[PDB]
Amino acid sequence: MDINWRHNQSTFYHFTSDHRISGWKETNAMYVALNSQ
Amino acid sequence: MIREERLLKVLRAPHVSEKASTAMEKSNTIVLKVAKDATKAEIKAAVQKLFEVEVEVVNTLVVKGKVKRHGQRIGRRSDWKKAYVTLKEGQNL
Amino acid sequence: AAKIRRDDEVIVLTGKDKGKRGKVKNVLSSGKVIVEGINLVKKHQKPVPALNQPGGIVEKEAAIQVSNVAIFNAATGKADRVGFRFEDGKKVRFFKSNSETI
Amino acid sequence: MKRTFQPSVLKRNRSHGFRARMATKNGRQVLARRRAKGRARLTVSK
Amino acid sequence: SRVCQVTGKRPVTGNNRSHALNATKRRFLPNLHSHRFWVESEKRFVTLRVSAKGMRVIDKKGIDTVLAELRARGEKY
Amino acid sequence: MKAKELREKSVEELNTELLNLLREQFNLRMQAASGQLQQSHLLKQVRRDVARVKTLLNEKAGA
RNA sequence: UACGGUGCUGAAGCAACAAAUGCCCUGCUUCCAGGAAAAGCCUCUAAGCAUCAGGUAACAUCAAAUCGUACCCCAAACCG
RNA sequence: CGAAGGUGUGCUGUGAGGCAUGCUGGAGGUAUCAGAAGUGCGAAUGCUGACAUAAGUAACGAUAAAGCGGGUGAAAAGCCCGCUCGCCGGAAGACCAAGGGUUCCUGUCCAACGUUAAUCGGGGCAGGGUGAGUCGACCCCUAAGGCGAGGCCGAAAGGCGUAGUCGAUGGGAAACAGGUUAAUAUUCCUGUACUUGGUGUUACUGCGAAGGGGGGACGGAGAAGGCUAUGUUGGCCGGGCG
RNA sequence: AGGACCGAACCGACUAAUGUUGAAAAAUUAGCGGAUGACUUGUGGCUGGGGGUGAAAGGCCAAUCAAACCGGGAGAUAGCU
RNA sequence: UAAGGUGAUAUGAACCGUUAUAACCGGCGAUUUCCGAAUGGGGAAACCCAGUGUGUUUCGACACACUAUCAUUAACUGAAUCCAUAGGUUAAUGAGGCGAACCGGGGGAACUGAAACAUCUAAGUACCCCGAGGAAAAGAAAUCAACCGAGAUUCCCCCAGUAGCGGCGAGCGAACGGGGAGCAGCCCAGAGCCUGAAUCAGUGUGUGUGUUAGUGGAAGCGUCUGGAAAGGCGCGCGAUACAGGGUGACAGCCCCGUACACAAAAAUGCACAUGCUGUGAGCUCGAUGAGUAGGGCGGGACACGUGGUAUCCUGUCUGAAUAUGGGGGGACCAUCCUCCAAGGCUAAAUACUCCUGACUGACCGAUAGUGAACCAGUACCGUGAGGGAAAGGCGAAAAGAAC
């Protein structure tokens, strides 16, 4: 359980996805930034 | 011919179970654990010459070893080989 | 070699049995000895459903250290240290203090 | 969805197996580092 | 490889320098040509990959002495 | 038994070789694995005794 | 009948019609975009061997080793 | 006759601090005066472990659906048996390949695992279980492609490649019906078969290759014709007359 | 006959709604396009990082791509926090 | 060596042994499956398939041995072609692969610094590759010096952050000379005289010493607290032994040891001596390293960035003199001094620690010290290269809790 918890905390450490906050969290930040311009 | 020094090392134990038992008491076949590298000619010759009976035909399967564990330490057992030795009409053992 | 050995009579120097004599039952390669009637522990063991079931509190002897015993002189009647001399190509033990071969 | 690891034993061995690490200079250096690090299984064979 | 079989001339390395002195790596190559040398003592043509001053030293030392050197150092011709 | 095996001929260590394997070894594997054979030390001493016969047999034959 | 079953016995066992995307069919027709290889298989001989060896046919006899074989497999057993 | 440490109390110094002592602890501590520092933490979206918070809150993973009787049990909505009800039925049935690797079957246990309970389980423990001349692999042959004696090439490592040698997803010998195990079956048993090699005898006889020829040897589409699997109906046979 | 027509398997992904600490790190449901072809699919093989491949989007190259991943130079450098 | 043993978790069962053929320790042997350079062919490592020869009183099947490639040498064969070479076959010898650092050589970055950046730096570093040894390399003046002299190479301390080099920026940075460690010289290019003359190398033997098992090894009791004494108190003894560890609290005298004195059947390392084989001393005379030195062009190394740049190395084109000669002495010339290139060998001082032994620490003590005190390069993660944990302590003794 401890090994699975360390690896499953280590899941989104090297991500790329920009529309999702922290790799996973859905948001509207594309529209927020885009409307700020 | 097969040398007798080879031919003694092949048979290893008689196999006791209920499939073995019904094979003896129903179809003349004695089931026995053999050497892992033992061919059917060696098992046939070794039952011909070590229990002095007449063997009709041998059928050999190989049984895979079970991964057991002690405590939190695993281990596979060990593969062995099982020979279904079908005797002729005149036999005892 | 070994100073205290198997069929030998010793006296106990330290603890719970200080001054008690007794014969060495056996001698364990931990550097311990079991000496009869000396280090009595009160084990109590379960009556296993296999071969015979004693149950109860069995009073065994425990292993004491080899350094806690010394072999009994009986010519002086006290504890005595052991040396090793050669006699006729035999490495014999001997009592110190009167120099007697055992 | 079709994930990336679609296993095949024959491609596992032809690709990353022992006879294929030993087949060249740099795979032998791979085996040398795995032995030197001291590793229970060197290649992926079985 | 580009080695003269007589003089043993490998390609060496160096720099293209420029007017601004920018160092770049280059290779100097030997003038290797594959020439076919008549040997009178054996009555044959032995073809070698010589430099263009392996031919100078064959013209001076003679082809027999040179082949004795190649046979001496295990260079197979 | 180490000098005793050392003082026979090659043919006689082949005889007691085949009798260590034949009579002793096989009958004790069959007897051991069929619930019989209280005395298990026999397996060990037979096995080491075959090691002695093969040792002296290799030492006697040639080098 | 340890009601889980276990043995014994066991009649008729035909015809008509419909019918495949399976089989004849690696066929047939056609079309350009013109549709693997090598062995087994059958044959021809060269060097050689030639009243021998080998080939064919019949009969008899021996052999056919080794490894896989459980179980899931559109899934609670594989990849997620 | 009780050290370090821990936890209180009392006294004391301007402070960092010091001193004494009750209880826990159970074996080490160290004056003074010097010496050396991994020498003092509340912050670094600090690192590691522990524990809170929201909070006994959202959720408990297809809206295919359950109801009752009986059994086992310490306990039954969930397990087993029975009767009903619903769902899939070109699949949510059956058989494999790949992949996994004992999950299979039996007995036994309910700690943890199972998003609940569990007597149940793909969970724990033990025992059992996989039977081949004909199925598949190995094997013979090759495609793409790999490797490659020599060789050509390249600072070295190495690149390419001839002969060759490997490489199936392709070509090449042969078994079917019925029965059986809790668990295997074209493998075991019953019946009836077939294939390829070795050896021996007998009769006839020209045999002989990393060589020649044939064959293997192979497209898309379409169209019917002849069949069969299979199904439907009648006849027959057994049973029912509700 | 047909890069022919309608339409299942099969390949895809146009719209909407749900979902967005999901049942799911890209799906479900209801409709939707192709469906004998420039189709689709299984098994194997080949191409590799300033390189591949690209019916071209800077797309894809193991949930990573205006230059992959791993290890090293390496405690880069940081007039900044 | 031995009275106890059959390795651990890990108890049992069945036994072996006690004065020597239990067990344990050491020397030398024997066996040493399969994979792996893997070597008979192949292959998805630990598997599949052979050929050849020898033997097998049931030789209808078994057992054993050999069969890789390459280099060198030899034998027998052998094309186009006559001779012959290429090629082919067989045999003998050697190699191949792994390994932590040190060493030599072939290639060789960039981030960075210059407060930008390009010359420069980083840096001939990282890394890749080849090769070798217990060390390697270098080495016996065509070297300095300076009109006096020194005398091979290597390493250390100065010289000296000096002279210089330098977008004369950032930076780079000597030598001469001095003090030490260590010290060793030789051979071929070549004939005669003369022989085994020193020399080493390979081996036998003998001696000495060391390694691989070991042996002996001093000396204490009473009483109080206490669960227990090694502690307190009292009185003794050892010490060439009070290094250390254990023992129920802190032991010189309880145990193992320590100081000290001894021990090897066998295998070995080193050093002398000696036998044989190979090898050559010494004398006279002669020779005394040519596509080379030097040059032109391009590049590199020298502290030296082409600059007034000596010197060394060479990719390319050339090209001498050869002891009445030639190289150097920091452009260059003359005078003077010094040395003899174009062939080679050479110990010691020196560098390093995969590995073994002993000892030591104002090193750490379980978030520290190795990533790893514990079955850790494990679990686990990743296709892969690779990444990579957490986790010690009952008690003095299991007496580990009968009922």
Domain boundaries, chain D: 1-46
Domain boundaries, chain C: 1-102
Pinpoint the alpha helices (H) of D1-46: 9-16, 18-21, 25-37
Q: Identify the contact set of chain B against chain F, taking CB-CB distances under 8 A.
A: 4-5, 8, 11-14, 16, 50
User: Taking CB atoms and an 8 Å limit, are B14 and F18 in contact across chains?
Assistant: no
Residues 6+ apart with CB under 8 A from A12: A22, A23, A24
CA distance C79 to C4: 12
Residues of F in contact with B8 (CB under 8 A): 21-22, 25-26
Cβ proximity of B31 and B85 under 8 Å: yes
Residue nearest to nucleotide J29 (CA to C1'): F59
CA distance C26 to C38: 13
Q: What tokens were used for D40?
A: 């229970």
The CA-CA-CA angle for residues D3, D6, D9, to 5°, reads 160
Resolution (A): 4.0
CA distance C3 to C91: 12
Distance from CA of F30 to the nearest CA of B (A): 6
Cβ proximity of E77 and E70 under 8 Å: yes
User: Taking CB atoms and an 8 Å limit, are B8 and F22 in contact across chains?
Assistant: yes
R_g over Cα of chain F: 13
CA distance F20 to F14: 10
Query: 3-state class of D3 per DSSP?
Result: coil
CA distance B44 to D38: 46
Residue nearest to nucleotide J97 (CA to C1'): D28
- Method of structure determination: cryo-EM
Cβ proximity of E7 and E51 under 8 Å: yes
Residues of B in contact with F26 (CB under 8 A): 8, 11, 50
In whole angstroms, H199 C1' to B44 CA is 22
CA distance B10 to F26: 10
Amino acid at residue number F20: N
Where b means 16+ CB within 10 Å and e means fewer, C42-62 reads: eeeeeeeeeeeeeeeeeeebe
Which protein residues have a C-beta closer than 7 A to any atom of strand G? B 39-41, 60-62, 64, 81; D 1-7
Q: CA-nearest residue of chain B to F18?
A: B5
Sign of the torsion formed by the C-alpha atoms of C62, C63, C68 and C74:
positive
Cβ proximity of E29 and E11 under 8 Å: yes
Q: From C65, C58, C56, select the one nearest C41 (Cα to Cα).
A: C58
If you count residue pairs, one on B and one on F, with CB atoms under 8 Å apart, how many are there? 23
CATH number of the structural domain D1-46:
1.10.287.3980
CA distance readout (Å), F17 to B4, B83, F51: 11, 27, 9
In total, chain A counts a number of residues equal to 37
